[PDB]
Amino acid sequence: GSSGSSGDKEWNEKELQKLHCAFASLPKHKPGFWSEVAAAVGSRSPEECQRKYMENPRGKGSQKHVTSGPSSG
Numbered sequence: 452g453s454s455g456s457s458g459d460k461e462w463n464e465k466e467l468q469k470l471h472c473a474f475a476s477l478p479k480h481k482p483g484f485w486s487e488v489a490a491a492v493g494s495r496s497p498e499e500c501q502r503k504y505m506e507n508p509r510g511k512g513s514q515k516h517v518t519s520g521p522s523s524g
Contacts, residue, residue, distance in 0.1 A: 473487060474504070485498065488500050
């Protein structure tokens with residue numbers, strides 16, 4: 452029947468697949484990897500593709516709210 456989920460800062464398959472796809476299609480050895488994956492993930496920003504992935508890298512991962520880890524940019 453009916454269904455849907457609204458009200459939870461999250462992406463959608465279309466995005467994910469785009470994030471992963473690109474992330475896969477495109478090399479991670481590249482510089483503006485985000486800018487790239489962001490191309491296909493246009494749906495979102497390249498700076499977000501990181502924040503997103505960071506949460507769901509592959510498995511558990513690591514989250515940080517206060518006093519972020521090592522920052523470089």
